[PDB]
Amino acid sequence: RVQGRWKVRASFFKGGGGSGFAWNVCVYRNGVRVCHRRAN
Protein backbone atom coordinates (compact mmCIF):
# COMPACT_ATOMS: atom_id res chain seq x y z
CA ARG A 1 0.00 0.00 0.00
CA VAL A 2 1.18 3.50 -0.82
CA GLN A 3 1.51 5.55 2.36
CA GLY A 4 1.32 8.67 0.24
CA ARG A 5 -2.14 7.70 -0.98
CA TRP A 6 -3.35 11.29 -0.95
CA LYS A 7 -0.11 12.34 -2.64
CA VAL A 8 -0.34 10.21 -5.80
CA ARG A 9 2.96 9.89 -7.68
CA ALA A 10 0.98 10.08 -10.91
CA SER A 11 0.20 13.71 -10.08
CA PHE A 12 3.85 14.69 -9.87
CA PHE A 13 5.11 13.62 -13.31
CA LYS A 14 8.87 14.25 -13.33
CA GLY A 15 8.73 14.39 -17.10
CA GLY A 16 8.32 12.21 -20.15
CA GLY A 17 11.98 11.57 -20.82
CA GLY A 18 13.97 11.34 -24.02
CA SER A 19 11.13 9.81 -25.99
CA GLY A 20 8.33 12.11 -27.09
CA PHE A 21 5.80 10.21 -29.15
CA ALA A 22 2.00 10.44 -29.27
CA TRP A 23 1.55 14.10 -28.33
CA ASN A 24 -1.95 14.01 -29.75
CA VAL A 25 -4.19 10.96 -29.64
CA CYS A 26 -6.86 11.02 -32.32
CA VAL A 27 -9.90 9.00 -31.35
CA TYR A 28 -13.29 8.79 -33.02
CA ARG A 29 -16.29 9.81 -30.96
CA ASN A 30 -19.32 8.77 -33.03
CA GLY A 31 -17.70 9.75 -36.31
CA VAL A 32 -16.01 12.79 -34.83
CA ARG A 33 -12.23 12.73 -34.84
CA VAL A 34 -11.11 14.10 -31.48
CA CYS A 35 -7.36 14.50 -31.04
CA HIS A 36 -6.62 15.03 -27.36
CA ARG A 37 -3.23 16.22 -26.19
CA ARG A 38 -2.66 15.32 -22.55
CA ALA A 39 0.34 17.15 -21.15
CA ASN A 40 1.34 18.48 -17.74
CSV table of N, CA, C and O in Angstrom, one decimal:
chain,number,residue,atom,x,y,z
A,1,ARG,N,0.8,-1.2,0.0
A,1,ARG,CA,0.0,0.0,0.0
A,1,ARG,C,0.9,1.2,0.0
A,1,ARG,O,1.9,1.3,0.7
A,2,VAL,N,0.5,2.2,-0.8
A,2,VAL,CA,1.2,3.5,-0.8
A,2,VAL,C,0.8,4.4,0.4
A,2,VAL,O,-0.4,4.7,0.6
A,3,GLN,N,1.8,4.7,1.2
A,3,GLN,CA,1.5,5.6,2.4
A,3,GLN,C,1.1,7.0,1.9
A,3,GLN,O,0.4,7.6,2.6
A,4,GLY,N,1.7,7.4,0.8
A,4,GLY,CA,1.3,8.7,0.2
A,4,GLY,C,0.1,8.5,-0.7
A,4,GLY,O,0.2,9.0,-1.8
A,5,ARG,N,-0.9,7.9,-0.2
A,5,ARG,CA,-2.1,7.7,-1.0
A,5,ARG,C,-2.7,9.0,-1.5
A,5,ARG,O,-3.1,9.1,-2.6
A,6,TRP,N,-2.8,10.0,-0.6
A,6,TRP,CA,-3.3,11.3,-1.0
A,6,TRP,C,-2.4,12.1,-1.8
A,6,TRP,O,-2.7,13.2,-2.3
A,7,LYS,N,-1.2,11.7,-1.9
A,7,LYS,CA,-0.1,12.3,-2.6
A,7,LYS,C,-0.2,12.0,-4.1
A,7,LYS,O,-0.3,12.9,-5.0
A,8,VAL,N,-0.2,10.7,-4.4
A,8,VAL,CA,-0.3,10.2,-5.8
A,8,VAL,C,0.9,10.6,-6.6
A,8,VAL,O,1.0,11.7,-7.1
A,9,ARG,N,1.8,9.6,-6.9
A,9,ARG,CA,3.0,9.9,-7.7
A,9,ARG,C,2.6,10.3,-9.1
A,9,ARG,O,3.3,11.0,-9.7
A,10,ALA,N,1.4,9.8,-9.6
A,10,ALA,CA,1.0,10.1,-10.9
A,10,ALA,C,0.6,11.5,-11.1
A,10,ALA,O,0.4,12.0,-12.2
A,11,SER,N,0.6,12.3,-10.0
A,11,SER,CA,0.2,13.7,-10.1
A,11,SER,C,1.4,14.6,-10.1
A,11,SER,O,1.4,15.8,-10.4
A,12,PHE,N,2.6,14.0,-9.9
A,12,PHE,CA,3.9,14.7,-9.9
A,12,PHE,C,4.4,14.8,-11.3
A,12,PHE,O,4.5,15.9,-11.8
A,13,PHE,N,4.6,13.7,-11.9
A,13,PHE,CA,5.1,13.6,-13.3
A,13,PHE,C,6.4,14.4,-13.4
A,13,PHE,O,6.5,15.6,-13.7
A,14,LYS,N,7.5,13.6,-13.3
A,14,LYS,CA,8.9,14.3,-13.3
A,14,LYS,C,9.3,14.6,-14.8
A,14,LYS,O,10.3,15.1,-15.0
A,15,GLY,N,8.4,14.2,-15.7
A,15,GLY,CA,8.7,14.4,-17.1
A,15,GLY,C,8.5,13.2,-17.9
A,15,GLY,O,8.2,12.1,-17.4
A,16,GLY,N,8.5,13.3,-19.3
A,16,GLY,CA,8.3,12.2,-20.1
A,16,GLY,C,9.6,11.5,-20.4
A,16,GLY,O,9.6,10.2,-20.4
A,17,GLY,N,10.7,12.2,-20.6
A,17,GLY,CA,12.0,11.6,-20.8
A,17,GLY,C,12.5,11.9,-22.2
A,17,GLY,O,12.2,13.0,-22.7
A,18,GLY,N,13.4,11.1,-22.7
A,18,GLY,CA,14.0,11.3,-24.0
A,18,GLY,C,13.0,11.1,-25.2
A,18,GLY,O,13.0,11.8,-26.2
A,19,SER,N,12.1,10.1,-25.0
A,19,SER,CA,11.1,9.8,-26.0
A,19,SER,C,10.0,10.8,-25.9
A,19,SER,O,9.5,11.2,-24.8
A,20,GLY,N,9.5,11.2,-27.1
A,20,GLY,CA,8.3,12.1,-27.1
A,20,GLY,C,7.4,11.8,-28.2
A,20,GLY,O,7.3,12.5,-29.2
A,21,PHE,N,6.7,10.6,-28.1
A,21,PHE,CA,5.8,10.2,-29.1
A,21,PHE,C,4.4,10.3,-28.6
A,21,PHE,O,4.1,10.4,-27.4
A,22,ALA,N,3.4,10.4,-29.6
A,22,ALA,CA,2.0,10.4,-29.3
A,22,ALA,C,1.7,11.7,-28.4
A,22,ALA,O,1.2,11.6,-27.3
A,23,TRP,N,1.9,12.8,-29.0
A,23,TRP,CA,1.6,14.1,-28.3
A,23,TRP,C,0.0,14.2,-28.4
A,23,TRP,O,-0.6,14.5,-27.4
A,24,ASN,N,-0.5,14.0,-29.6
A,24,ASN,CA,-1.9,14.0,-29.7
A,24,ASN,C,-2.4,12.6,-30.0
A,24,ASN,O,-1.8,11.8,-30.7
A,25,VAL,N,-3.6,12.2,-29.4
A,25,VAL,CA,-4.2,11.0,-29.6
A,25,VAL,C,-5.5,11.2,-30.3
A,25,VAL,O,-6.5,11.7,-29.7
A,26,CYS,N,-5.6,10.8,-31.6
A,26,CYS,CA,-6.9,11.0,-32.3
A,26,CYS,C,-7.8,9.8,-32.2
A,26,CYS,O,-7.5,8.8,-32.8
A,27,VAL,N,-8.9,10.0,-31.5
A,27,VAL,CA,-9.9,9.0,-31.3
A,27,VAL,C,-11.1,9.4,-32.1
A,27,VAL,O,-11.3,10.6,-32.5
A,28,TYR,N,-12.1,8.5,-32.3
A,28,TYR,CA,-13.3,8.8,-33.0
A,28,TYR,C,-14.5,8.6,-32.1
A,28,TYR,O,-14.8,7.6,-31.7
A,29,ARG,N,-15.1,9.8,-31.8
A,29,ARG,CA,-16.3,9.8,-31.0
A,29,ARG,C,-17.5,9.9,-31.8
A,29,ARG,O,-18.0,11.1,-32.1
A,30,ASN,N,-18.1,8.8,-32.2
A,30,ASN,CA,-19.3,8.8,-33.0
A,30,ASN,C,-19.1,9.5,-34.4
A,30,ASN,O,-20.0,10.2,-34.8
A,31,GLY,N,-18.0,9.2,-35.0
A,31,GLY,CA,-17.7,9.7,-36.3
A,31,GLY,C,-16.9,11.0,-36.2
A,31,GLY,O,-16.5,11.6,-37.2
A,32,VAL,N,-16.8,11.6,-35.0
A,32,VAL,CA,-16.0,12.8,-34.8
A,32,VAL,C,-14.6,12.5,-34.4
A,32,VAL,O,-14.4,11.9,-33.3
A,33,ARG,N,-13.6,12.9,-35.2
A,33,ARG,CA,-12.2,12.7,-34.8
A,33,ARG,C,-11.8,13.7,-33.8
A,33,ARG,O,-11.8,14.9,-34.0
A,34,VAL,N,-11.5,13.2,-32.6
A,34,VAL,CA,-11.1,14.1,-31.5
A,34,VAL,C,-9.7,13.8,-31.1
A,34,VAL,O,-9.4,12.7,-30.6
A,35,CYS,N,-8.8,14.7,-31.4
A,35,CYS,CA,-7.4,14.5,-31.0
A,35,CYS,C,-7.0,15.2,-29.7
A,35,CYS,O,-6.9,16.4,-29.7
A,36,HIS,N,-6.9,14.5,-28.7
A,36,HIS,CA,-6.6,15.0,-27.4
A,36,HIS,C,-5.1,15.0,-27.1
A,36,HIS,O,-4.5,14.0,-27.3
A,37,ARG,N,-4.6,16.1,-26.6
A,37,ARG,CA,-3.2,16.2,-26.2
A,37,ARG,C,-3.2,16.3,-24.7
A,37,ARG,O,-3.5,17.4,-24.1
A,38,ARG,N,-2.8,15.3,-24.0
A,38,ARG,CA,-2.7,15.3,-22.6
A,38,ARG,C,-1.2,15.6,-22.2
A,38,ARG,O,-0.3,14.8,-22.4
A,39,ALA,N,-1.0,16.8,-21.6
A,39,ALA,CA,0.3,17.2,-21.2
A,39,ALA,C,0.3,17.9,-19.8
A,39,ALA,O,-0.7,18.7,-19.6
A,40,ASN,N,1.3,17.8,-19.0
A,40,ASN,CA,1.3,18.5,-17.7
A,40,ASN,C,2.6,19.4,-17.7
A,40,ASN,O,3.7,18.9,-17.3
